[PDB]
Amino acid sequence: LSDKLKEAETRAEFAERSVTKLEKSIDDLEDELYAQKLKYKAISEELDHALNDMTSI
Amino acid sequence: LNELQALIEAHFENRKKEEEELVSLKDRIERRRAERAEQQRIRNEREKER
């Protein structure tokens, strides 16, 4: 049990670290998805707004 | 060509309105999920403090 605990603790710590890595990667995806949407629909949708004007004339 | 007019406006108005709204609506959902991340950070700190 001491080893099972160290192993479970390794797993708990692993999971805390894995969760930490994923806390970081979820935030990176939360920020990257955010940034990509924020820049991508905001720019390309803006480019389609610009289409409204670009294709006028 | 009433259709060019229908399309020039439908493309812009339907999308800018629906799309920009999704940007800000989700920005708030995302901010709340980011708050959840902060609350998990708080939860982890509190468990350690206890």
Partner: peptide, 29 residues
């Protein structure tokens, strides 16, 4: 930019027709 593929065609027709006339007007002598 289909709006202008279509506007292009309209103006193309307007000029082609004006041009057809420019060419005829000169051709008529």
């Amino acid at each position: 930019m289909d709006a202008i593929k279509k506007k292009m065609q309209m103006l193309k027709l307007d000029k082609e027709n004006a041009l057809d006339r420019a060419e005829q007007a000169e051709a008529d002598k």
